[PDB]
Amino acid sequence: SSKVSEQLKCCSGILKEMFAKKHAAYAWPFYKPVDVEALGLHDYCDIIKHPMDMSTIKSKLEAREYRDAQEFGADVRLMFSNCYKYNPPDHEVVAMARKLQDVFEMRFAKMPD
């Protein structure tokens, strides 16, 4: 029963939506950590210093590792920025990231006061 605890509940709701069937078409690459053993991803860890994904953010929320919504937000944006940094700007996964980020940014912006 506080301002910060209510906003963190909203964050959990936002992430739940991101995991929903509704967005699955473009959200799926962000579900689990980038598999750096996959062909073509041998250099991922050379380029991406701080990997992030939605399962990791979910575990961090559930282990209460986010002091506030801004910290949760930073991890969501890290995930997207990693995608934009690593992949070629014309790769389909970049388009998918933008589609999911549009969902996130709209919900995050309209979090209650």
Ligand X SMILES: CC(=O)N1CCN(Cc2cccc(C)c2)c2ccccc21
Q: At what angle do helices 69-86 and 3-18 cross, to 10 degrees?
A: 30
Sole binder of ligand X in the list 6, 17, 19, 29 (CB under 6 A): 29
DSSP SS3 for 37: coil
CB contact set of 53 (below 8 Å; sequence gap of 6+) = 30, 31, 32, 33, 34, 79
| Interacting span for ligand X (CB under 6 A) from 16-24, 67-75, 89-97, 104-112 | 89-97
First to last CA, the chain: 14
By CB under 6 A, name the one of 93, 103, 107, 111 that touches ligand X.
93
From 3-11, 14-22, 64-72, 83-91, give the range in contact with ligand X by CB under 6 A: 83-91
| The token pair that represents 2 in the structure block | 């506080």
Is residue 34 a contact point for ligand X (CB under 6 A)? yes
Residue of the chain from 66, 86, 104, 108 that contacts ligand X (CB under 6 A): 86
Residues forming contacts to ligand X in the complex (CB under 6 A) are 29-30, 34, 83, 86-87, 92-93, 96
